Amino acid sequence: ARKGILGTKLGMTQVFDENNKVVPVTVVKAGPNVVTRIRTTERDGYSAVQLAYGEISPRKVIKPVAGQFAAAGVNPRRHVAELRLDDEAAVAEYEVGQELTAEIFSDGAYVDVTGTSKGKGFAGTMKRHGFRGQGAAHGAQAVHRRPGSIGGCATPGRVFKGTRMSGRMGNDRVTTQNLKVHKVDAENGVLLIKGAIPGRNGGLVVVRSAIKRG
Amino acid sequence: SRIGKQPVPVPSGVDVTINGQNLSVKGPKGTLTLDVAEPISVSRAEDGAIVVTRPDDERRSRSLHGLSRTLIANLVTGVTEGYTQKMEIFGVGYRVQLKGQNLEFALGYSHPVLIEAPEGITFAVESPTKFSVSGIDKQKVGQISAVIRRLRRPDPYKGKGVRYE
Amino acid sequence: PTYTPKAGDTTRSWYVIDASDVVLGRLASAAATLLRGKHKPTFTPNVDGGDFVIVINADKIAVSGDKLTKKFAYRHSGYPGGLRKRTIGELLEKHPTRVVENAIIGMLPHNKLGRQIQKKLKVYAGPDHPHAAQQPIPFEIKQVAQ
Amino acid sequence: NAAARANDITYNRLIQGLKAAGVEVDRKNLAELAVSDPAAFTALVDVARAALPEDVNAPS
RNA sequence: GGGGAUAAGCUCCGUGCGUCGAGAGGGAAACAGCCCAGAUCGCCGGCUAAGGCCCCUAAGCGUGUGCUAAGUGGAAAAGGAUGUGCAGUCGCGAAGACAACACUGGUCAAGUGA
RNA sequence: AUGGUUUGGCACCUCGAUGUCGGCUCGUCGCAUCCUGGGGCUGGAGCAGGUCCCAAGGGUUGGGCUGUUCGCCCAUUAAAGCGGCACGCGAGCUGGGUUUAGAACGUCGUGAGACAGUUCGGUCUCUAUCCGCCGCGCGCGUCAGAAGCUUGAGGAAACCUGUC
RNA sequence: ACAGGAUAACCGCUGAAAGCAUCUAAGCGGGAAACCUCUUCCAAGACCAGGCUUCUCACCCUCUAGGAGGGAUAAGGCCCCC
């Protein structure tokens, strides 16, 4: 069904295809993932597979997480995540301890990458919501960037929950869809994905098969 | 009301099973199952028929009593020898044929048109211009006949398309 | 003076009501009366002296007229244009319990004591309940003829 | 009303029967009897039932 | 009753007419002017008025005979409409009625029309 | 017959203060739908329309003249919708118009002066207490104290279209 | 976006009341950028405060032994530091 893997965003570079066109590609370290736990309807109510990624020294894990990993039967890993499947026949091909690597994907496949967007801090409406600021001249007094009108004239006399104003921005989980995998470097376990994936370099990303184009 | 007071004859060669209001009938052409309305009871007449008895005389019962009778009549005449619907085309360049259990039409569109045959019906095509569909239920046969009629919009000018006999 | 319940006076009993072919208003009114404790001679509006009520066969409730496809259960999120409306039919086919829950809840006081009384009502769409350990007493909706 | 309905009788019919029977106990002591002495309330319900007419809906 | 467009929650007059003003209590969800009723104080007594008795909410998922399918009840007009109950007429009709197969003939089989 | 979107009428509302038009910024709602979507009849041959139903998810341009709303015009576009919310929005902005004090023209008055006639110029104050809204924490709760991974009742976002 | 469900105008099949007829009062179907799912995100303070697991899984003193209070701890967390 829908395959998936945990990886790390390494950076972005440039490649040329067989038509000599340029292809801006993001490098993803789709390293080895180990299945740690299997979610089943009969036990958890839903079907999903749990993957572990990253390497950490054994003295950095707390006792509960170390105990969970030992009960699973594998060495602890830095990151743990779940892949929600659709049914038991989908989860029948995963068993605890099985190692997932990058070559599950093929050249030309369409993938969905999920990551945490970059942080932008306390951002104003001009940046957060694309508001058009007021005039920078012609007598405008200290309103060059303020949003302007909020509500109107009494009536509800309130502000209509969901009003777009300034606040914290970024640092939210974001999924980019229908990204084409240009090349699967099996020996480095590296995926060359055409396009831009969310997050900073060295961040955790989840590469899943596309839900629309797959 | 008037039609329902006459019990419908039941052939001896076809089994009629009555379970309260749920009725199942096994004929030579197959089997069909019908449910009767709750204000009306039904009973297999011992002289080779069934009894359409209406105990109330209010608008609802007087309305559905004849309807139930004619539904029973249609069900028995469909389990005995079924139904057959005949179709044909008017015009030129239109060709109709049977591809196994599925119907393929070339009405003149740039793409081929396929018709899916549901259960209980079959397609008889003795000529490209004219063809037939047969089944044991009148409602299903009529619905499929209308669907097959619908592949062309009505033509009040040349009358090109399909029309009933 | 008039009798007033003390700390240890209140006692509760468990009633299970079958909702198969029952008018929703009638069942809801009976359940609200049972929950309120109006049927006990020691009733006091101050105290929650009601009884735990279990409702099974919630999906089998009876709705007269055409209210199945013309009565709406409204709810507003608060956002602009956040009004959502569902007829009793889809509400029953999706969340069978919620219809009876709303019907019963609408019939008891909207006070804080009503919120506390809501804690004593359990409804189930199936024909069986997990509260067999309490040995509920079957309850039949009867009318005292006058 | 709760105590009377526990004895299969409505409050209004019970009051009418009590008035017909001549018992002059007010509602305060009636409620006190219902809460504290159910047997006395049952006896009063019985005498009220006895005092009631045969057909309550008759034009009498 | 006048003025205004007999429109105004408009204005001006008449009334051994009322209420509020200067008036609490109950009802009309809230609600000076509508309905019941004029508070000397206390009571953990009773009977009632207007209004009500499925739950919120005190007291009737009251009894008997019918109507309503529209949630009418729980907003409104000209006008339109094979909804239905009751009653009253008339047309035609077992010499076979209507339908079905303008007016006429045959099968059929009680009601059929305004 | 609806509506209070137009001018009205009354004056119940505030003269121990309720900013008066346009524009900018930001909205939300109705459908009596401008395009896209689904159909009917065509006095519809096809194209394209005419007209009438269903449909409010999205979209609905940039300029010249005028303070303008309105309007006319220039290019386009799938289309350049109609309205409600103090004819939304000045403790958000502007002061071009109107609506003080200066001055002039025409007209009226003997005169001081005046003109829902015209023209030039002419201070837009405030450190957010409460509700409201956008974000972020502290405390407690979820019947021992913790830690990983999550199900989701419920809610929000998005929904356009052209040519070949 | 694709796909599915129920639908609006509409197109229908099967036929009564009303011996015929009638997309209709019983029924069964098709039918839209609208509706419910479907895509993305938030979400158990969802007081019905959820679920699957894993870890510690114990040591005193006091008033009076009914409960309470105090102390020291385990898993773990925070503060100080980079």
**Calculated CA dihedral for residues C13, C19, C23, C25, nearest 10 degrees:** 40
Please indicate, yes or no, whether residues B46 and B90 belong to a single structural domain of this protein.
no
Closest CA to C17 of C61, C50, C48, C66: C61
Task: Tell me the two tokens of residue C132.
Answer: 């067999």
* Test the C interface: residue of D14, D30, D35, D42 with most C CBs within 10 Å: D35
Alpha carbon distance B150, B100 (integer Å): 22
CA distances from D55 to C2, D13, D51, D60 (A): 35, 12, 12, 9
Structure token pair of residue A180: 């084409």
List the domain range (segments joined by +) for residue C12.
1-146
Q: Which tokens hold the place of A170?
A: 């970024």
Provide the domain count of chain C. Answer: 1
Q: Is residue B78 part of a domain?
A: yes
Structure tokens at B147: 């669907």
Q: Which of C135, C122, C117, C119 is nearest to C36 (CA)?
A: C117
Closest CA to A56 of A39, A80, A72: A80
**Cα→Cα distances C115→B44, C109, C119, C120, C124, Å:** 58, 8, 7, 10, 20
Looking at the structure, tell me whether residues B56 and B110 fall in a common domain.
no
Overall domain count for chain B: 2
Tell me the residue type at B11.
Answer: P
Query: Which of C23, C10, C37 lies closest to C114 in space, CA to CA?
Result: C37
Are residue B30 and residue B93 in the same domain, yes or no? no
Q: Which nucleotides of G are covered by protein (CB under 7 A)?
A: 1, 11-20, 25-29, 36, 39-42, 47-48, 51-56, 75-77
Residues B91 and B137 in one domain: yes
Residue B114: exposure state from Cβ atoms within 10 A (0-12, 13-18, ≥19): exposed
Cα distance between residue B136 and residue B79, in whole Å: 6
- Residue ranges covered by each domain of chain A: 1-214
The experimental method is cryo-EM
Evaluate whether residue B10 is within a structural domain: no
The CA distance from C50 to C121, in Å, is 10
Name the domain boundary from B40, B57, B83. Answer: B83
Q: What is the resolution of this structure in A?
A: 2.7
Distance, CA of A210 to CA of A214 (rounded, Å): 5
User: What is the 8-class DSSP label of residue C134?
Assistant: G
Q: Examine residue B72 and state whether it is found in any structural domain, yes or no.
A: yes
Q: Coil, strand, or helix at residue B145?
A: helix
Tokens 């359990």 correspond to: C122
Which nucleotides in chain E have some atom under 7 angstroms from a protein Cβ? 44-47, 53-64, 69-71, 83-84
Tell me how far apart the alpha carbons of residues A162 and A121 are, in angstroms, rounded to a whole number. Answer: 20
Nearest to B124 by CA among B116, B115, B133, B113: B133
Asked whether the beta carbons of residue C144 and residue D35 sit closer than 8 angstroms, the reply is no
Last residue within a domain, chosen from B34, B52, B83: B83
Assigned domain for B34 exists: yes
Tell whether C6 lies on the interface with D, counting CB pairs under 8 A: no
Q: Which domain holds residue B154?
A: 84-164
Residue owning tokens 């090349």: A183
DSSP code of residue B7:
P
Backbone angle region of A73, left / alpha / beta, with phi > 0 → left and psi within -120 to 50 → alpha: left
Distances, alpha carbon D37 to alpha carbons A96, A179, D18, D29, in Å: 70, 82, 17, 11
Would residue B57 count as lying in a domain?
yes
Angle of helix D27-36 versus helix D38-51 axis, rounded to 10 = 130
Q: After which residues is chain D broken (C to N over 2.5 A)?
A: none
Cβ(B163)–Cβ(B90) below 8 Å: yes
| A179–chain C nearest CA distance, Å | 34
